[PDB]
């Protein structure tokens, strides 16, 4: 028990620091004393850290920090710097974060190693599923290393069909070796035996299967394939004792069809079943959007009641940007956020998310795929530099609505009129309220 565990994320922030448990993503907000102490632990070990802050320990300031189960023994080498310079850099870092007024680094990194896909889902948010310039895993390894060192929480491997990416196995192995909490989302049709084996034995990587419904007819209409492959692979992961998740997009499923999926997830011990809002934000989707966010809540109520009334257990969730607009009873002007939560909740593109396309384009969100503005290259510039200076981030971060209703809304600071990308499409973005908003 000499240094911070690899299963724990610690980061300096403008207000002090943040602690996140990578197993359930529960956060702990730290003051400067706690943060600087743990910063020394991170770079010099507990003995040096405790010796340095002996006065603070004596005064009882670090009782909570010392009591937390976040310590371990690592093979990572300590900083060559003097602890005083490390503390010096910590103060400079905090002051810099105050000046820029940003979170230190995205928690969520989403990489698209190849935009190629073997399918053509009618609901796919991508414009095209072709790619002949995908980079090798070695180039992506440099990206992951930056992400880890700057305090990323999780990495999501998308596309495109990532299991059709030629260098997927090496990419997955790289994630495992770096001990990065990772997910990979796949249509599961032609996943390689080598890829399944890597996932089955993985500690840090969780597979997510894209499956709309057990109904063979309807799933073929939506994805162009039967559910057979997804079903079969979900069963396999259960039998080998590997956690596996399922994500469906709420396009035109009936309640009875969703419940069929719920029952399947229960019996095959799915770790998480998520139903996503059908997002048109990119502007490339084809299938007509039948349900809104209010309808998504309606489904959440129906499913949660079914699980309860049937006395079953399932980590069920509904997800989508601005989903909170369907919960008017929970919204009021007495809502108060911490410094972190105010920048974390709402639009993740502002201060917590980064997405990297196959060509290296750094987007605050996939929504910017339909925005005609220049994008910086991750294969030629450091992620951290971009996180600070990027004009797309700067635009969405500094955007403020002038809408009368929004200005009096309790969730104003985390929403600002709705999706920034949707708003800039309109004639007067600052006065337009996004139509997704059910309030």
């Amino acid at each position: 028990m000499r240094t911070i565990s690899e299963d724990i994320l610690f980061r300096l922030e403008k207000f002090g620091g943040i602690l996140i448990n990578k197993t359930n993503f529960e956060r702990i907000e730290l003051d400067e004393t706690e943060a600087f102490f743990l910063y020394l632990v991170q770079n010099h070990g507990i003995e040096i850290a405790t010796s340095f802050f002996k006065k603070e320990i004596e005064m009882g300031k670090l009782e909570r920090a010392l009591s937390l189960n976040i310590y371990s023994d690592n093979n990572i080498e300590d900083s060559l710097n003097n602890p005083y310079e490390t503390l010096q850099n910590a103060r400079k870092h905090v002051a810099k974060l105050k000046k820029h007024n940003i979170l230190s680094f995205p928690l969520e990194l989403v990489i698209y190693p190849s935009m190629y896909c073997d399918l053509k889902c009618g609901f796919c948010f991508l414009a095209n599923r072709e790619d002949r310039n995908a980079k090798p895993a070695k180039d992506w390894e440099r990206i992951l290393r930056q992400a880890k060192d700057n305090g990323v929480l999780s990495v999501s491997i998308l596309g495109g069909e990532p299991t059709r990416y030629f260098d997927i196995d090496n990419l997955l192995i790289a994630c495992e070796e770096l001990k990065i909490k990772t997910t990979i989302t796949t249509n599961a049709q032609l996943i390689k035996k080598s890829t399944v084996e890597i996932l089955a034995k993985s500690k840090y990587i969780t597979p997510v299967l894209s499956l709309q419904t057990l109904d063979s007819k309807l799933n073929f209409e939506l994805m162009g394939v039967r559910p057979d492959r997804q079903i079969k692979l979900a069963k396999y992961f259960n039998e080998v004792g590997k956690k596996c998740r399922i994500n469906a997009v709420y396009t035109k499923q009936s309640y009875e069809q969703i419940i069929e999926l719920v029952d399947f997830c229960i019996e095959n011990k799915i770790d998480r079943f998520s139903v996503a809002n059908y997002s048109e934000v990119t502007g490339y989707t084809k299938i007509k959007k039948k349900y809104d966010l209010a309808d998504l809540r309606r489904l959440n109520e129906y499913v949660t009641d079914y699980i309860t009334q049937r006395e079953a257990n399932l980590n069920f969730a509904t997800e989508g940007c601005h989903l909170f607009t369907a919960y008017p009873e929970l919204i009021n002007n007495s809502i108060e956020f911490s410094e972190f939560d105010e920048m974390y909740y709402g639009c993740r593109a502002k201060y917590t998310k980064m997405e990297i396309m196959s060509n290296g384009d750094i987007l605050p969100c996939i929504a910017f795929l339909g925005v005609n503005q220049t994008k910086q290259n991750a294969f030629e510039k450091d992620l951290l530099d971009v996180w600070y200076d990027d004009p797309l981030y700067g635009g969405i971060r500094s955007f403020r609505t002038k809408n009368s209703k929004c200005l009096s809304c309790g969730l104003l600071k985390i929403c600002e009129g709705g999706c920034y990308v949707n708003l800039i499409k309109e004639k007067s973005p600052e006065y337009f309220r996004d139509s997704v908003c059910q309030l």
Binding site: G320, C321, L323, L330, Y345, R348
Partner: peptide, 13 residues
């Protein structure tokens, strides 16, 4: 607030 936090956590893609 626990209810509000769950909804806000889900308010994302």
């Amino acid at each position: 607030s626990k209810e509000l936090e769950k909804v806000l956590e889900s308010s994302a893609m």
